[PDB]
Design a binder for this molecule. Structure first.
Ligand SMILES: Cn1cc(-c2ccccc2)nc1CCNC(=O)c1c(C(=O)N2CCC2)cnn1C
Ligand SMILES: [Mg+2]
Ligand SMILES: [Zn+2]
Length: 313
C-alpha cells in the first residue's frame, strides 16, 4: 500500500515528456509501466502482485521480432501515459485503468507480419478473423492472460464495470489496425469542424480513444531524431522479411516491403508523415490541445526526413 515505485531523477523528469525513450535496460520496463499506472490511475487501481504477474505474462507473450516486441508495447503505453497525464480531467476512472493495459497488450503475440501477409499465406488466424486479423488476435490474447489464475487485475470491478473496461480495451486494440484510422480520423475531422464533437457521446469518445491509439502506436515519429531513425530500421527489418516471405509465395511485395527498394525509404517516410502521422497528431491536437508536443515533434522529424532526401544527412 505505502510501496511507491520511484525512478532515478533523469527518468522521473523525462518520463512525463511525450518524447521519452524507455531505454535499453529491458529489466526496468515493468517498473516504468507500474510507475505510470500508479501516477495515471492510482496506487489503488490494481493489486501490485496481480499487476506484476499480469505484466510478466504479457512480456512472455510478445515475440523476439525486430519491432512488434515488448519494447514497442511499453513505448506505446508510455505515449498513452503522457496523453492521460496532460488531459487530467477528460477521462473516466475505467478509461485510465483500461487504456494503459490496452496499450501494453495491443500487439500481443505479434509475429512481425501484416494482416495482408496472413491473408495471402492463408494463416488460420485469417479464417478465424476476416478483418483486423492480428488486432482481434491481440484482444483474444489479452482476455487469455486476464483469465490466468492470479492475473485478474480487474477483479475488484463490478460485472458491468468489468464488461465496460474490456469493451474499452477491445475497441482500443481494434483501433490500432491502421486500415481503420483513415475513416476514423475523417469522421473526427468532420465532427470537430462542424462543432458536432461531443465527449458525452460514447460513440464520439470511442472515436477519440481510437485516434489516441493510432497516435500512441505511431509515436516513434514523435521522438528525438536518433530514436525515430533507429526505430525505422526495426520497422523496415520486419517489412523486408515480410517482403521476402511474399516473394516465397510468388507475389512481388509492395515497395515498402521490398529490401531491393531500400533507397526509396526517405520518400516513403515523407508520404507516411504527410498521409498518416501529421494528420493524426493534427486532429489529436485539435481535440486535445495539450498533445501539441506530439504534432510539433512529428513535424521536426518530417523536416529531418526532408534533409535526408536533400543529402544533408
Ligand atoms: C508508406 N511507406 C512507404 C514506404 C516505402 C519505403 C521504401 C520504399 C518504398 C516505400 N515507407 C513507408 C512507411 C513506413 N511505415 C512506417 O515507417 C511506420 C509505421 C507503419 O507503417 N506501421 C505498420 C506497422 C507499423 C509505424 N510507424 N512508422 C514509422
Ligand atoms: Mg498492431
Ligand atoms: Zn503497435
Amino acid at each position: 500500500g505505502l510501496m511507491q515505485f520511484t525512478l532515478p531523477v533523469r527518468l522521473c523528469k523525462e518520463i512525463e515528456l511525450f518524447h521519452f525513450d524507455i531505454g535499453p535496460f529491458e529489466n526496468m520496463w515493468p517498473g516504468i509501466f507500474v510507475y505510470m499506472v500508479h501516477r495515471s490511475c492510482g496506487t489503488s487501481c490494481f493489486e501490485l502482485e496481480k499487476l506484476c504477474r499480469f505484466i510478466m505474462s504479457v512480456k512472455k507473450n510478445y515475440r523476439r521480432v525486430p519491432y512488434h516486441n515488448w519494447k514497442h508495447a511499453v513505448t506505446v503505453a508510455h505515449c498513452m501515459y503522457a496523453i492521460l497525464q496532460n488531459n487530467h480531467t477528460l477521462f473516466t476512472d475505467l478509461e485510465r485503468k483500461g487504456l494503459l493495459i490496452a496499450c501494453l497488450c495491443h500487439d500481443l503475440d505479434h509475429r512481425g507480419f501484416s494482416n495482408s501477409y496472413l491473408q495471402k499465406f492463408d494463416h488460420p488466424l485469417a479464417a478465424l478473423y476476416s478483418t483486423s486479423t492480428m488486432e482481434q488476435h491481440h484482444f483474444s490474447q489479452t482476455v487469455s492472460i486476464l483469465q490466468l489464475e492470479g492475473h485478474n487485475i480487474f477483479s475488484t470491478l463490478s460485472s458491468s464495470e468489468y464488461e465496460q473496461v474490456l469493451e474499452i480495451i477491445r475497441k482500443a486494440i481494434i483501433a490500432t489496425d491502421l486500415a481503420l484510422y483513415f475513416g476514423n480520423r475523417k469522421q473526427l475531422e468532420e465532427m470537430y469542424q462542424t462543432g458536432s464533437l461531443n465527449l458525452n457521446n460514447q460513440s464520439h469518445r470511442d472515436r477519440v480513444i481510437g485516434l489516441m491509439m493510432t497516435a500512441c502506436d505511431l509515436c516513434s515519429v514523435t521522438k528525438l531524431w536518433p530514436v525515430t531513425k533507429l526505430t525505422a530500421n526495426d520497422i523496415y527489418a520486419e517489412f523486408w522479411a515480410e517482403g521476402d516471405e511474399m516473394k516465397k509465395l510468388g507475389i512481388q511485395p509492395i515497395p515498402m516491403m521490398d529490401r531491393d527498394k531500400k533507397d526509396e525509404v526517405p520518400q516513403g517516410q515523407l508520404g507516411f508523415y504527410n498521409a498518416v502521422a501529421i494528420p493524426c497528431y493534427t486532429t489529436l491536437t485539435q481535440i486535445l490541445p495539450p498533445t501539441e508536443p506530439l504534432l510539433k515533434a512529428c513535424r521536426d522529424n518530417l523536416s529531418q526526413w526532408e534533409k535526408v532526401i536533400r543529402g544533408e544527412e
